[PDB]
CSV table of C-alpha atoms in Angstrom, one decimal:
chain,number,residue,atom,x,y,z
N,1,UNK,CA,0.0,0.0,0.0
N,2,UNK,CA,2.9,2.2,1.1
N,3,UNK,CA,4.1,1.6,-2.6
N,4,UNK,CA,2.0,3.5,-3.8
N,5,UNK,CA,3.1,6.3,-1.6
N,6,UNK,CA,6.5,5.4,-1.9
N,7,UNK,CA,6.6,7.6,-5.2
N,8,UNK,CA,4.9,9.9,-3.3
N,9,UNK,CA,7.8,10.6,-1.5
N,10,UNK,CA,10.9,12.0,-2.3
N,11,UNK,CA,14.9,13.1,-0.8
N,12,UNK,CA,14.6,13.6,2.7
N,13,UNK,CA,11.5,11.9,3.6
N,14,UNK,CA,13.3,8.6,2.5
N,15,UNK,CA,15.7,9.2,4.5
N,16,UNK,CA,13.7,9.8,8.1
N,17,UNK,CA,11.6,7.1,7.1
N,18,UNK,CA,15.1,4.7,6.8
N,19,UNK,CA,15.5,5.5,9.8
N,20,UNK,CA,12.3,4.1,11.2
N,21,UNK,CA,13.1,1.4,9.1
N,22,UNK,CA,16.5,0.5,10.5
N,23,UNK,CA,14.7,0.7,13.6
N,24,UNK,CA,12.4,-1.9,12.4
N,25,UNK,CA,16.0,-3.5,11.4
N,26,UNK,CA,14.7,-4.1,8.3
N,27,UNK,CA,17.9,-3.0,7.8
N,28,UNK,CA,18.2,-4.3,3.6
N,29,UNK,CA,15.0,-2.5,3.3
N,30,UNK,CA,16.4,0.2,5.0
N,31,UNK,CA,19.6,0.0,2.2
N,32,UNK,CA,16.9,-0.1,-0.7
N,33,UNK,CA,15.7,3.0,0.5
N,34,UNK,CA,19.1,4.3,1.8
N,35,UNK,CA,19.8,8.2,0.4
N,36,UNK,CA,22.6,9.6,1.7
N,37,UNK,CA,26.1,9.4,1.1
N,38,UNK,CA,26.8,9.4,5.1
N,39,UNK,CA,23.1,7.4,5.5
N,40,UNK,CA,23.6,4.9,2.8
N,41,UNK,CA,27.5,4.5,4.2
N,42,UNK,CA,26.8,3.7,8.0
N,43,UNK,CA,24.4,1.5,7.0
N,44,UNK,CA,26.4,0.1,4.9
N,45,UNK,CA,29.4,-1.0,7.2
N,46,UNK,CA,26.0,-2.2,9.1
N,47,UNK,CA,24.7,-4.0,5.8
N,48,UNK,CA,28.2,-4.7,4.4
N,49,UNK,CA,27.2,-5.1,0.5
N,50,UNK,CA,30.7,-5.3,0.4
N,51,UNK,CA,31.2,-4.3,-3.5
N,52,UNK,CA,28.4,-2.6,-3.0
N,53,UNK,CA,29.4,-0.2,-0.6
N,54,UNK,CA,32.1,0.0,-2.7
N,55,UNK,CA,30.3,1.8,-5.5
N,56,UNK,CA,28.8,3.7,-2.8
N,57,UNK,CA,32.2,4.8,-1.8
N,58,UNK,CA,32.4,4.9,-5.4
N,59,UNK,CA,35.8,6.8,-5.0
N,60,UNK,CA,35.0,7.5,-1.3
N,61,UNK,CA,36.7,11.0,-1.4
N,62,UNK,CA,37.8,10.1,2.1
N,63,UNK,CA,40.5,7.9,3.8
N,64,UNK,CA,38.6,8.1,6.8
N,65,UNK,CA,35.9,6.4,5.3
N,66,UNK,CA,38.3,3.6,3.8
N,67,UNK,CA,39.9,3.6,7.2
N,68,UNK,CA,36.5,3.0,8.5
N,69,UNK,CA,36.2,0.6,5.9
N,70,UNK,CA,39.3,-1.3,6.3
N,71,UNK,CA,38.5,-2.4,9.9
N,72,UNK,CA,35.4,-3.5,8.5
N,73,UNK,CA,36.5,-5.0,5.6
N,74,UNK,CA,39.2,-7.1,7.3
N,75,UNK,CA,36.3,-8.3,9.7
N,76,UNK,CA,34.2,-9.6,6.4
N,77,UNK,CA,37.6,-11.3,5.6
N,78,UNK,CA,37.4,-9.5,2.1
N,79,UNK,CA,41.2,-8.6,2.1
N,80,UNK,CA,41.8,-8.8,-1.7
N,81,UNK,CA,39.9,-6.2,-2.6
N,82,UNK,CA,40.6,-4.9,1.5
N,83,UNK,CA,44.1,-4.4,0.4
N,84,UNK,CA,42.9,-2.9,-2.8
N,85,UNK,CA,41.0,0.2,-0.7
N,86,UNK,CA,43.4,0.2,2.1
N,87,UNK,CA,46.2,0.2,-0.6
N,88,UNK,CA,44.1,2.8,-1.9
N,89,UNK,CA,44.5,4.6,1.3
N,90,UNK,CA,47.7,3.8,1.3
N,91,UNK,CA,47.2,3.0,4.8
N,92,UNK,CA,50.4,1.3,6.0
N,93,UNK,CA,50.2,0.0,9.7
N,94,UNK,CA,47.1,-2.0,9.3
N,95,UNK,CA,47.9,-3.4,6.2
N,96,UNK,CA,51.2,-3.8,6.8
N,97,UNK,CA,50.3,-6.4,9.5
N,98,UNK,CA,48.3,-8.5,6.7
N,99,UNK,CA,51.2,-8.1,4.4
N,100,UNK,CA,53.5,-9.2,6.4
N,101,UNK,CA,51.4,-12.1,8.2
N,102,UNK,CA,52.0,-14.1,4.9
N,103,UNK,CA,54.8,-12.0,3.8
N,104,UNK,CA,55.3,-10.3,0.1
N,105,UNK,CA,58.8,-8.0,-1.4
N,106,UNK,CA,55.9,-6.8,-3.7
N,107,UNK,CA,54.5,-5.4,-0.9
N,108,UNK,CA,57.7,-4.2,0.1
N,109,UNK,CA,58.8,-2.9,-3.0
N,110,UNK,CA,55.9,-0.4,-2.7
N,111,UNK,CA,56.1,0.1,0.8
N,112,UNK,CA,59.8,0.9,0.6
N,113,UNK,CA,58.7,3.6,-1.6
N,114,UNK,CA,56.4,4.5,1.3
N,115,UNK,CA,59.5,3.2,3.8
N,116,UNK,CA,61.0,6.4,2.4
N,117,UNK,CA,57.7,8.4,2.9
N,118,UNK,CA,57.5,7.4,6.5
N,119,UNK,CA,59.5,10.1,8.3
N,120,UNK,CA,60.8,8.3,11.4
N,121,UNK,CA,63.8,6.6,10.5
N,122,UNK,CA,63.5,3.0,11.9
N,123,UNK,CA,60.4,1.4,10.4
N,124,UNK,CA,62.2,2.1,7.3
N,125,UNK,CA,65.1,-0.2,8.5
N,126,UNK,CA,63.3,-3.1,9.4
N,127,UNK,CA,61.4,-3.0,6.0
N,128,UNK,CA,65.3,-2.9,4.6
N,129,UNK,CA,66.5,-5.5,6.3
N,130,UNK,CA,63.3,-7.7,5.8
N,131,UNK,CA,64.1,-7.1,2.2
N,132,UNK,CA,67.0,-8.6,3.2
N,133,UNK,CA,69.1,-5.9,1.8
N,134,UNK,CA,72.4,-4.1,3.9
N,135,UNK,CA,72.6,-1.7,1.6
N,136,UNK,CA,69.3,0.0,1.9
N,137,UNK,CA,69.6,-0.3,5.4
N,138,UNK,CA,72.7,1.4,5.2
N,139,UNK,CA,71.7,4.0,2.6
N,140,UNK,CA,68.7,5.1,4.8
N,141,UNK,CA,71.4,5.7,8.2
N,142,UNK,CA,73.2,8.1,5.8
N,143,UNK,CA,70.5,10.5,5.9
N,144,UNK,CA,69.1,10.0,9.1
N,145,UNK,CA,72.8,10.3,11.3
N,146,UNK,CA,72.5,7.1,12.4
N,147,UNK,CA,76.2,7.0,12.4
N,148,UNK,CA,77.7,4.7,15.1
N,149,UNK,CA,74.9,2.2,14.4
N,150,UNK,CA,74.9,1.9,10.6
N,151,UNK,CA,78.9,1.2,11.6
N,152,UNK,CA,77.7,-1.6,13.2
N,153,UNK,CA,75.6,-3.3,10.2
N,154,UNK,CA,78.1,-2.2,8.0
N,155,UNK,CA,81.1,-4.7,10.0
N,156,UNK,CA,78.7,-7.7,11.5
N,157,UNK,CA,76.9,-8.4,7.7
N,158,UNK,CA,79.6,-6.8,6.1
N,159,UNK,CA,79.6,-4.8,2.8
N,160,UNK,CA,82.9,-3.6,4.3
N,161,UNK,CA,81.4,0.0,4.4
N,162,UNK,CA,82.9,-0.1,8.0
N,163,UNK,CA,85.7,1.2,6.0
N,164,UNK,CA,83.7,3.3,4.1
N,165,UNK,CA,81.7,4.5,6.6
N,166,UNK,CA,83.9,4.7,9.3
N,167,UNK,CA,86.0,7.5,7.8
N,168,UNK,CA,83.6,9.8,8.1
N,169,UNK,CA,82.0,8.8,11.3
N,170,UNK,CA,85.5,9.6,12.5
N,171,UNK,CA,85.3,12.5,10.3
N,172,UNK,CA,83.2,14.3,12.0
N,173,UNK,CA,84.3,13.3,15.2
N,174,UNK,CA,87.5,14.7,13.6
N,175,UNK,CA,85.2,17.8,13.3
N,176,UNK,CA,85.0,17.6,17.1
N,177,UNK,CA,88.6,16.7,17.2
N,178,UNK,CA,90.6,15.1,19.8
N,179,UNK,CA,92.8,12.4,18.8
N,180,UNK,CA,90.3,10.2,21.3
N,181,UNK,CA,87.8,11.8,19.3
N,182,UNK,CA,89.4,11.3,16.2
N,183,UNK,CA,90.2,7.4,16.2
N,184,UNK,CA,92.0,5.9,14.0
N,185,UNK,CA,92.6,2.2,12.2
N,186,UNK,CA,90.6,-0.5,9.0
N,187,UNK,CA,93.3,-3.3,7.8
N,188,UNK,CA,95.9,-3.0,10.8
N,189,UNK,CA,96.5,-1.1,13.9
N,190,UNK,CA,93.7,-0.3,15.8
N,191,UNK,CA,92.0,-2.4,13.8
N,192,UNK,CA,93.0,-4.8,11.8
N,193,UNK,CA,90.0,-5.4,9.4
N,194,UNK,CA,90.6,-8.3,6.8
N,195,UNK,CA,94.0,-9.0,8.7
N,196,UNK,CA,92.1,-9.8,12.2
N,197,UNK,CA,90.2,-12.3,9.6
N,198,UNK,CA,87.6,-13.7,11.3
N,199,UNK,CA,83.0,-13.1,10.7
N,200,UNK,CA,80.8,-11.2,7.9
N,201,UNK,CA,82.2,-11.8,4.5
N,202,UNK,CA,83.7,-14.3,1.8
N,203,UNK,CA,82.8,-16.6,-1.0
N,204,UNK,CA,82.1,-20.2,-0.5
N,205,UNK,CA,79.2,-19.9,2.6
N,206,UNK,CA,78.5,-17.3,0.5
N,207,UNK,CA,78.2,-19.9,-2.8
N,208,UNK,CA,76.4,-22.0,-1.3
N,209,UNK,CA,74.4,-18.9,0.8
N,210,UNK,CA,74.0,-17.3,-3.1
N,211,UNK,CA,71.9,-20.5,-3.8
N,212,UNK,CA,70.5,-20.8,-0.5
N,213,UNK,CA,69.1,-17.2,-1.2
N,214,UNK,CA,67.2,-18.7,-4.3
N,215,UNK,CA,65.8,-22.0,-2.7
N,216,UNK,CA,63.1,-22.7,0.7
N,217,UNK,CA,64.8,-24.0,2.9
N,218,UNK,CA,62.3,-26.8,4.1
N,219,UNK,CA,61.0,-28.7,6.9
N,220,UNK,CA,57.7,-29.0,5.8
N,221,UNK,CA,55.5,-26.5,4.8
N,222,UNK,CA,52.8,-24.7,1.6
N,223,UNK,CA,52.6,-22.6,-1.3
N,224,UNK,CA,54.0,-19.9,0.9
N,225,UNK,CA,57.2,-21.1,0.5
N,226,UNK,CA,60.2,-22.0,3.2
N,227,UNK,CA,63.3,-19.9,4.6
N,228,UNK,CA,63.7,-21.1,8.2
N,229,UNK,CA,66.6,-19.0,10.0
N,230,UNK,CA,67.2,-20.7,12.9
N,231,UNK,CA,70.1,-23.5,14.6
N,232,UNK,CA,70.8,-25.2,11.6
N,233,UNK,CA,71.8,-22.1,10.2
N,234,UNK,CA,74.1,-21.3,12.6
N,235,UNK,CA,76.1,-24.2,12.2
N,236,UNK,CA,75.6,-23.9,8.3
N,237,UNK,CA,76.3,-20.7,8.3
N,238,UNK,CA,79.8,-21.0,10.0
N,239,UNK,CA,80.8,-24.2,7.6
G,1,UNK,CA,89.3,23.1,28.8
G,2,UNK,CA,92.5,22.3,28.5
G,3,UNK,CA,92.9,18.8,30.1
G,4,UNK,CA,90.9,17.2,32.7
G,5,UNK,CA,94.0,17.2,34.6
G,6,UNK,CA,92.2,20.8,35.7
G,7,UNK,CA,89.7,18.6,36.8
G,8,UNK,CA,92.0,17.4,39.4
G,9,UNK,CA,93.3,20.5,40.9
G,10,UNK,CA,89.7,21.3,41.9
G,11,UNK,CA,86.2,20.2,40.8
G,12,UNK,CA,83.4,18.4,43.4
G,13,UNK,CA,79.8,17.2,44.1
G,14,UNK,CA,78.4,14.9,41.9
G,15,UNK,CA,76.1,17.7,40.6
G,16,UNK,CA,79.3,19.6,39.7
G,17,UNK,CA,81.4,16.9,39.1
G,18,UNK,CA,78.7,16.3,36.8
G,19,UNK,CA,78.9,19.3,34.7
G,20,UNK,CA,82.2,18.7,34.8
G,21,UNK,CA,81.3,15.2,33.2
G,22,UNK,CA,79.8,17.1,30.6
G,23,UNK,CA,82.0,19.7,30.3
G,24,UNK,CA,85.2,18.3,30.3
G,25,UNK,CA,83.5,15.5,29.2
G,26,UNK,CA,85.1,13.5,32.2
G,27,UNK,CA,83.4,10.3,31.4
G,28,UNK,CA,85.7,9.1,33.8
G,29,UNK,CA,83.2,11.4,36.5
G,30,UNK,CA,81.1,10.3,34.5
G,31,UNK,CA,81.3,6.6,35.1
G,32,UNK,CA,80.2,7.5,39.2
G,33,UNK,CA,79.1,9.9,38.2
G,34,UNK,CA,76.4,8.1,36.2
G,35,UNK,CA,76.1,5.8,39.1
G,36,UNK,CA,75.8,8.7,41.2
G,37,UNK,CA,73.9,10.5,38.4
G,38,UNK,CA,70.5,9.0,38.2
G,39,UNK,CA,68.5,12.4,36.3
G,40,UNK,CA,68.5,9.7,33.5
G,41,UNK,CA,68.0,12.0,30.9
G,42,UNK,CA,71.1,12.7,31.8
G,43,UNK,CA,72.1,9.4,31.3
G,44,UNK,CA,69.9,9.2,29.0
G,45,UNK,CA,72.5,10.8,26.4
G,46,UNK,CA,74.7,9.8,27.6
G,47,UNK,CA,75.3,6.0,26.7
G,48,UNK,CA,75.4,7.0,23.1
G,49,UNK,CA,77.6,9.9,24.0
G,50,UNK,CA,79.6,6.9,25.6
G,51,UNK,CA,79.0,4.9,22.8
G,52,UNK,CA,80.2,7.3,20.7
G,53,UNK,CA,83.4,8.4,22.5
G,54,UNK,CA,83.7,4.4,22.8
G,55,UNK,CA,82.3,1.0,24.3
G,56,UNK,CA,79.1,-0.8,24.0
G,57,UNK,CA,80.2,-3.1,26.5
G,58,UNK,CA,79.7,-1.0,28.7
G,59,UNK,CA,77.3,1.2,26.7
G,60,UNK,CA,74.9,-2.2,26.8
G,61,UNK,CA,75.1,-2.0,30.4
G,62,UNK,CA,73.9,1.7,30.9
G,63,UNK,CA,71.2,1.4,28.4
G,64,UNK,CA,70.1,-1.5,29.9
G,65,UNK,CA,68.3,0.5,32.8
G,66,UNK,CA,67.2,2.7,30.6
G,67,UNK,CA,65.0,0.9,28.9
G,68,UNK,CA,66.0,1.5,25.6
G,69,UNK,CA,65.6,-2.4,25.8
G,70,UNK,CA,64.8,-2.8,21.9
G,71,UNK,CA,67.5,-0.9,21.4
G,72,UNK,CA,69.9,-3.0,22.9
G,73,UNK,CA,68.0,-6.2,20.9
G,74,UNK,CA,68.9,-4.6,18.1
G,75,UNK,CA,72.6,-4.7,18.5
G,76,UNK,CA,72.0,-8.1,19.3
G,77,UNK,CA,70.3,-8.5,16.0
G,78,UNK,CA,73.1,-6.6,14.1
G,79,UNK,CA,75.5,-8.8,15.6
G,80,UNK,CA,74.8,-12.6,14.6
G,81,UNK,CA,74.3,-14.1,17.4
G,82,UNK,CA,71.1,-15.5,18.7
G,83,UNK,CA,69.7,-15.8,21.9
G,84,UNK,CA,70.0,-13.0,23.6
G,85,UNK,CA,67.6,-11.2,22.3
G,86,UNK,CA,65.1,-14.5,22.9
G,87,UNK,CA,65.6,-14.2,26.2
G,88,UNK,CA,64.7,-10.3,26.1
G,89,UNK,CA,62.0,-11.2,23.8
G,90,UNK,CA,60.5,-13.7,26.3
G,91,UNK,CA,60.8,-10.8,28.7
G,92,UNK,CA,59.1,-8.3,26.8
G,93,UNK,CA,56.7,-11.0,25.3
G,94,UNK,CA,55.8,-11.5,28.8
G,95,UNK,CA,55.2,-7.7,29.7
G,96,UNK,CA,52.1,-8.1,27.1
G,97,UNK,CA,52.0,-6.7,22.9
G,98,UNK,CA,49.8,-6.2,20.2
G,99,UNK,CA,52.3,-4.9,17.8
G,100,UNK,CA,55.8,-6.3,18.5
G,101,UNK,CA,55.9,-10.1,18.2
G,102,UNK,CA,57.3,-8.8,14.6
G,103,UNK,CA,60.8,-8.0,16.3
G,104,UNK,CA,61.2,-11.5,17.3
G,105,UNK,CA,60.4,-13.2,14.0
G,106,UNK,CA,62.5,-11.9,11.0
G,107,UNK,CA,65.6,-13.0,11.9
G,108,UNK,CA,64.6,-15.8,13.4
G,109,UNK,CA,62.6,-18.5,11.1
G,110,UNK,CA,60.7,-20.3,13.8
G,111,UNK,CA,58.5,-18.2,16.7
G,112,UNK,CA,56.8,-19.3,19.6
G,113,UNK,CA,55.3,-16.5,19.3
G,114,UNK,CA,52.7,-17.9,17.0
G,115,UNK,CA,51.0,-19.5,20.5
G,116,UNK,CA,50.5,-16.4,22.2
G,117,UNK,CA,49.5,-14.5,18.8
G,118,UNK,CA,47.1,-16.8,17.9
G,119,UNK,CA,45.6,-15.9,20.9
G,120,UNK,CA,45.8,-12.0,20.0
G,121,UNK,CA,44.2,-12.6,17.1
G,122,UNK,CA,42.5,-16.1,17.6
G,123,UNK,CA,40.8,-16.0,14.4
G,124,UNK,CA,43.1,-18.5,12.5
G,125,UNK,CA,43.7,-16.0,10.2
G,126,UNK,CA,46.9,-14.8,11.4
G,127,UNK,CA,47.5,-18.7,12.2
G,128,UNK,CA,47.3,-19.6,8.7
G,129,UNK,CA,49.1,-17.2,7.6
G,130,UNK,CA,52.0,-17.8,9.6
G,131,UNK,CA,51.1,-21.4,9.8
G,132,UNK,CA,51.7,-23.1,6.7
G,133,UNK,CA,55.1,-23.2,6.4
G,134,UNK,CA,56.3,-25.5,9.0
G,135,UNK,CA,54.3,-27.4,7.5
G,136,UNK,CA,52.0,-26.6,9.6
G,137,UNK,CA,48.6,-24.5,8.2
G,138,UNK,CA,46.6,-27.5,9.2
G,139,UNK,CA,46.1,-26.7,13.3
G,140,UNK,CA,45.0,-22.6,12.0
G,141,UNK,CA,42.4,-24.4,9.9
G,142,UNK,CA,41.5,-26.8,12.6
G,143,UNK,CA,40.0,-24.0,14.7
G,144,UNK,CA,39.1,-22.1,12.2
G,145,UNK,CA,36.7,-24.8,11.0
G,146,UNK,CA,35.4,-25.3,14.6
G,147,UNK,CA,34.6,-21.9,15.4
G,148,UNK,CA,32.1,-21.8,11.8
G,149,UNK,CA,35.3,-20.0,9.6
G,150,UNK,CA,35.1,-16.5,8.5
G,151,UNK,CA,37.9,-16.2,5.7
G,152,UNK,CA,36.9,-15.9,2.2
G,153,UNK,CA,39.2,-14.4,0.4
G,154,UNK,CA,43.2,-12.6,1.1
G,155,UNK,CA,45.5,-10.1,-1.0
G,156,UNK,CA,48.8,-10.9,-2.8
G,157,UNK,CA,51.0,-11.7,0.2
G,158,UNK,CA,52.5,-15.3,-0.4
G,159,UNK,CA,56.4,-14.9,1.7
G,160,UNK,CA,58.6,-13.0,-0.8
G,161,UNK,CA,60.5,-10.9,0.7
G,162,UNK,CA,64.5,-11.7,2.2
G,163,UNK,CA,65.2,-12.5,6.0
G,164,UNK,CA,68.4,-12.7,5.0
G,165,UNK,CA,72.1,-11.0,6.3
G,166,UNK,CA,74.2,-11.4,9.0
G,167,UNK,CA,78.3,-12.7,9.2
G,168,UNK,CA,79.7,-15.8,8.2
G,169,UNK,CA,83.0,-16.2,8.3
G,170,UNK,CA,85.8,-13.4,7.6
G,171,UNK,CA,84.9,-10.1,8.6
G,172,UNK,CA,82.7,-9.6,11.8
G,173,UNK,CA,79.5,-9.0,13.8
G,174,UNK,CA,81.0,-6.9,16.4
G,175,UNK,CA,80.1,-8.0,19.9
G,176,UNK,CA,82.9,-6.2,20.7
G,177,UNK,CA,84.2,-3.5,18.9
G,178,UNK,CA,88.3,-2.5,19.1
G,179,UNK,CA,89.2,1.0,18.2
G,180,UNK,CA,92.3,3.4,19.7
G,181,UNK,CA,92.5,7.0,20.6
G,182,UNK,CA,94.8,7.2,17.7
């Protein structure tokens, strides 16, 4: 009967009336009604037409609304196209925590680009290192000042840029001079680099490691393939 | 200054021995004086200042009350050696997390984590996820089943990035780090 009226009604009279009709929880009544963008889009993360809100978003013109959204989204278990709006937002912790859970380099490439958007140094690191790659790591500490700790990569996983690196560390404590200050050795004296001879560089582990790079390493495992990193390793590792 | 040497002819409380320790840069009033000191932030510099002008050995030590605890697990990290940040990890594992489980993991391969997480997350989501490779997806999807599952669909994310970096032999990991004034 109301049908009839229904035409007989237009903008905002739709929308009260939703109202009384999400209060009669008729809720995907209520979203064949729906009219307005804000109406249609609470109802929505109520209703969760999932593509549908979607088109409602249409582009949302919003992060808030995909962060919103993403929560949402996540919940619904709707993560392919999740990561397609929260990639959309661009929104990095959240789905950063997805990413990672399986893991993905794609991910990361992208994300180093965003790595370098970030603004506070470290998360940037661990995305570098996750990479697996020194030399981002290290290239990142250059701007930052991270000087006495990029040192420290730079020797224990060696890309020798303890040399490198260490001259002008010492540099610009040379800048502050004071022959303490200053310090002073890489092959021999103070230090003794590639004479002391003894963990973070060479070729055969490395060989081997070059492979070892390419394969899973295996126990037992799916189409998310193996690594490990653990004792065996270690005593690879040494070899 | 000139030498701390001035120091000795006269200098005294630990306040002003302190700003001495600053100002001379006595770190040797500085060692008390940082036992004496105890204004953290003061400290709280500090180490790294120590660090700087030299030794994590100790530097490890004077960080280690200051909480700068991932910190020093990262210089375990950096260093190629294993447990010591396991144990710290157990210890800050223990004081709770939401968002930290991650420091554990990379560097590692296997986490025990995954029991506690699981828990965090409980929806055998994250337990797949993780799962799978040990060869072991098959417990997230036992609970998952039970529960009436909820997972329909995921994005890209199959493991493809490198854990991978550290020290074998010939040139270092530093637990220890030589130097010399000259």
């Amino acid at each position: 009967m109301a049908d009839k009226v229904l035409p007989t009604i237009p903008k905002e009279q739709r929308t009260r009336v939703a109202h009384f009709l999400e209060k009669q929880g008729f809720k995907q009544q209520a979203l064949t009604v729906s009219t307005d963008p804000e109406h249609r889009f609470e109802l929505a993360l109520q209703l969760g037409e999932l593509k549908i809100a979607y088109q409602l978003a249409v582009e949302a013109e919003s992060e808030q609304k995909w962060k919103q959204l993403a929560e949402l989204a996540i919940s619904k278990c709707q993560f392919s196209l999740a990561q397609e709006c929260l990639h959309h937002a661009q929104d990095y912790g959240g789905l950063l925590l997805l990413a990672t859970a399986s893991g993905n380099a794609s991910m990361v490439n992208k994300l180093a680009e965003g790595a370098e958007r970030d603004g506070k140094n470290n998360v940037a690191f661990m995305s570098y290192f996750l990479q697996g790659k020194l030399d981002a790591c290290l290239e990142l500490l250059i701007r930052t000042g991270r000087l006495p700790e990029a040192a420290f990569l730079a020797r224990t996983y060696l890309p020798s840029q303890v040399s490198r690196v260490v001259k002008l560390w010492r540099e610009n404590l040379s800048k502050v001079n004071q022959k303490a200050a200053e310090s002073l050795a890489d092959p021999t004296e103070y230090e003794n680099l590639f004479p002391g001879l003894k963990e973070a560089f060479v070729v055969e582990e490395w060989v081997k490691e070059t492979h070892a790079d390419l394969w899973p390493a295996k126990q037992y495992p799916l189409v998310t393939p193996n690594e490990e990193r653990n004792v065996m390793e270690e005593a690879k590792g040494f070899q | 200054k000139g030498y701390p040497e001035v120091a000795l002819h006269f200098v005294k409380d630990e306040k002003t021995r302190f700003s001495l320790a600053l100002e001379c840069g006595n770190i040797e009033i500085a060692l008390e004086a940082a036992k004496a000191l105890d204004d953290k932030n003061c400290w709280e510099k500090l180490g790294e200042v120590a660090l700087l002008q030299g030794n994590h050995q100790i530097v490890e030590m004077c960080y280690q009350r200051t909480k700068n605890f991932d910190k020093l697990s990262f210089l375990y990290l950096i260093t190629g050696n294993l447990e010591k940040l396991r144990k710290m990890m157990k210890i800050a594992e223990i004081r709770k997390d939401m968002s930290g489980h991650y420091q554990n993991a990379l560097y590692l391969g296997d986490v025990s984590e995954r029991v506690r997480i699981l828990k965090n997350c409980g929806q055998k989501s994250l337990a797949y996820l993780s799962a799978a490779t040990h060869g072991l997806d098959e417990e997230a999807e036992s609970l998952k089943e039970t529960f009436d599952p909820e997972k329909e669909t995921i994005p890209d994310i199959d493991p493809n990035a490198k854990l991978l970096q550290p020290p074998a032999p010939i040139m270092p990991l530093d637990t220890n780090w030589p130097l010399l004034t000259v």
